């Protein structure tokens, strides 16, 4: 006869974007209408003592 | 007379495969029907994340 021993399937790790410490640089915020917008912007007033 | 003093037998220590620390690499198993089989095999399935 020709015996066959136990088969194995590879198991996967479950990473997430918030789990990583690289996310600390990120400040993600979902926005469902994101395709509709053109570009965001911010204005910064400054005056010099 | 040509005197003959004591005589000494050759005592010998006994070894075992389980006593060796090399057995830690081994996975000991017995299988009495081994003479019948040709070759075993192990199939492994793997997928890449």
From Swiss-Prot, chains A, B:
It comes from the Viruses. It is found in: Virion; Host nucleus. Belongs to the herpesviridae major capsid protein family. Homomultimer. Makes the hexons and eleven out of twelve pentons. Interacts with triplex proteins 1/TRX1 and 2/TRX2; adjacent capsomers are linked together in groups of three by triplexes, heterotrimeric complexes composed of one molecule of TRX1 and two molecules of TRX2. Interacts with scaffold protein; this interaction allows efficient MCP transport to the host nucleus. Interacts with capsid vertex component 2/CVC2. Interacts with the small capsomere-interacting protein/SCP. Self-assembles to form an icosahedral capsid with a T=16 symmetry, about 200 nm in diameter, and consisting of 150 hexons and 12 pentons (total of 162 capsomers). Hexons form the edges and faces of the capsid and are each composed of six MCP molecules. In contrast, one penton is found at each of the 12 vertices. Eleven of the pentons are MCP pentamers, while the last vertex is occupied by the portal complex. This is Major capsid protein. It comes from Human cytomegalovirus (strain AD169) (HHV-5). The lineage of its organism: Viruses, Duplodnaviria, Heunggongvirae, Peploviricota, Herviviricetes. The chain holds residues 50 to 98 of 1370 of the full protein.
